[PDB]
Design a protein around this ligand. Sequence first.
Ligand code: S8V
Length: 152
Amino acid sequence: APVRSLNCTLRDSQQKSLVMSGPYELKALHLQGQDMEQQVVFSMSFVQGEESNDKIPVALGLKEKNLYLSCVLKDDKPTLQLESVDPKNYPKKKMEKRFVFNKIEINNKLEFESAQFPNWYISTSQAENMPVFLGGTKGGQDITDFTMQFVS
Ligand SMILES: C1C[C@@H](CNC2CC2)CO1
């Protein structure tokens, strides 16, 4: 059958929102009130992959954009990028591995581990207005925990 998707927003555990800041660039900042319309709405697809009670493979597309978060080696390091795709072919149930995150539920929070790069996580900085990035470190001024919000 089709692939199933939900619209949602994400906030880091310090409650910073994610907003598109220039061509292909997600940034995390503290947001409230009018400015909350700036936040990125994801289409979270439930994709093929290794699964357990608390570990669910997803893809993170930007709502009604042919753009996905992906994990690739850049200058020899696992990095997070926004990657464009053929809008005729996405989303799909069998997403390529660079697009797949293991959504892990621990203590009422979510972590997004790269399926491609074990123990590398979607991360934010403690500082305001810095890039969302892939981090291979868990607890060291890098926020790897998020809360999920379901939107209409
Ligand atoms: C989405 C992917 C990431 C790209 N980082 C590179 C510095 C641009 C930031 O937002």
